[PDB]
């Protein structure tokens, strides 16, 4: 059994043409997980994960702040205490329009990698 | 399966009493359940003050994230208390359980492969 403070997992900066101002912690990764992986994303103020889609679903829980969720059209802001289920193939992305960091858990089946 | 995205306040789900020979003082919200999940389910457990999930094991793993309070984790050997912001991975067949020794509700997300139900 593994019991660990998530903050102590070293975050990975992601900074690409589609993703800026994001950090990703892999809490339960391919090394441990039989079926699905557990990540924790931090989105800095102004951070953006562009619209994209995957052949797998996402299961998300918003841990901190106000997360702007981009949909195939339009967007919806939700806050800490919301869960999100993104169906397979659904176009989606995320933005932080607030002045403080936003955090969410994001789990995918292991075919999506870690 | 279907398209779209569900976005919902977890507390808009009513916490339902779990009562079995090995569990007392616990409620559960199914957030992403069997009716929708392709692979794995997401539940939010509430452990009332003095609530107990006795040591047990399952043939599937558990992935847990502690949301609120101080959760005492029962292991095959001894116990350990963690708090909000901890995650827990429980291997398949690993003996584990939980207790709330505090005065206030403890909450944690618990995800399992959907073959284990919801």
- B94: contact with A, CB 8 A cutoff: yes
CATH architecture of B1-118: Sandwich (2.60)
**Joined tokens for residue A94:** 């995320």
The residues, ordered by sequence, that sit 6+ positions from B33 with a Cβ below 8 Å of its Cβ are B41, B118
DSSP A4: E
Q: How far is CA B10 from CA A20, A21, A38, B26, B67, in A?
A: 28, 27, 18, 16, 12
Resolution limit, Å: 1.2
Residues of B in contact with A4 (CB under 8 A): 86-87
**Joined tokens for residue B23:** 């569990």
The domain spans of chain B are 1-118
For A17, the 3-state DSSP assignment is coil
Give the angle A50-A51-A53 at the CA atoms, nearest 5°: 125
CA dihedral in degrees (B111, A107, B99, B68; nearest 10)?
-130
Give the separation between CA B2 and CA A86, rounded to whole angstroms: 10
Query: Which of A56, A59, A92 shows the shortest C-beta gap to B42?
Result: A59
Does A92 carry a binding-site annotation?
yes
Residue that has been written with the tokens 């969410």 in this structure: A104
CATH number attached to the domain at A1-114: 2.60.120.10
Strand partners, A95: A48, A68
Report the structure determination method.
Answer: X-ray
Residue that has been written with the tokens 């969720």 in this structure: A69
For B14, the 3-state DSSP assignment is coil
Question: What is the DSSP code string of A78-98?
Answer: EETTEEEEEPTT--EEEE--S
Pairing outcome for strands B5-9 and A82-86: antiparallel
Largest Cα separation within chain A, whole Å, is 42
Beta strands in B3-105 (DSSP E): 5-9, 16-20, 23-32, 40-56, 62-68, 70-75, 79-83, 86-90, 96-99
- B3: contact with A, CB 8 A cutoff: yes
């Amino acid at each position: 059994m593994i019991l660990k403070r998530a903050y102590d997992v070293t975050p990975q900066k992601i900074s690409t043409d589609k993703v800026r101002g994001v950090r990703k912690r892999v809490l339960i990764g391919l090394k441990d997980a039989p079926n699905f992986v557990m990540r924790l994303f931090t989105v800095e103020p102004g951070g953006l994960i562009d619209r994209h889609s995957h052949p797998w679903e996402h299961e998300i829980f918003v841990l901190k702040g106000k997360l702007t969720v981009l949909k195939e059209q339009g967007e919806e802001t939700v806050e800490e205490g919301f869960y999100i289920f993104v169906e397979p193939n659904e176009i989606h992305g995320f933005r932080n329009d607030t002045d403080s960091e936003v955090e969410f858990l994001c789990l995918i089946p292991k075919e999506g990698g870690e």
